[PDB]
Amino acid sequence: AKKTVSYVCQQGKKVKVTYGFNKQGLTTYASAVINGKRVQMPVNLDKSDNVETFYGKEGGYVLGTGVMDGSYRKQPIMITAPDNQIVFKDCSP
Ligand code: NA
């Protein structure tokens, strides 16, 4: 099961993100279209905690958000590039 959310961020940047959900109701990935290219970021269970979910791996793009269940449309997000610069900042749905 997929669900898509459109966001507006700092400096007017816009991004659409698609979240995958398994049969347990947990998210498995976040897929963001960045310069026209689909960037799929797998959920990072080692880095996720009671307040924040992270998607992505070292060397790739990394998405950070709140706790995601079928909650997900009310969460803010941020996306950091491989160089560690926050390229989508303070994003709201
Ligand atoms: Na980069």
Numbering used by the authors: 30 to 99, 101 to 123
What's in the article?
Nm-ACP acts as a minor adhesin, mediating the adherence of meningococci principally with epithelial cells. In summary, we have identified a new function for Neisseria ACP as an OM-located, surface-exposed lysozyme inhibitor, in addition to its role as an adhesin and as a potential vaccine candidate. ACP is found in all pathogenic and commensal Neisseria spp., and despite structural similarity to the MliC/PliC family proteins, it shares no conserved motifs involved in lysozyme inhibition.
Crystallization trials were initiated on the purified protein, and native data were collected from a single crystal to 1.4 Å resolution. The interaction between β8 and β1 is stabilised by the disulphide bridge between Cys38 and Cys121. The computed surface electrostatic charge distribution showed that the face of the β1-β4 sheet is predominantly basic, whereas the β5-β8 sheet is more apolar, apart from the loop between β4 and β5. All three structures superposed onto Nm-ACPI with r.m.s. deviations of less than 2.0Å, and all preserved the same eight stranded β-fold, although sequence identity with Nm-ACPI was less than 20% in each case. The sequence motifs SxSGAxY and YxxxTKG, which were conserved in the MliC/PliC family proteins, were not retained in Nm-ACPI.
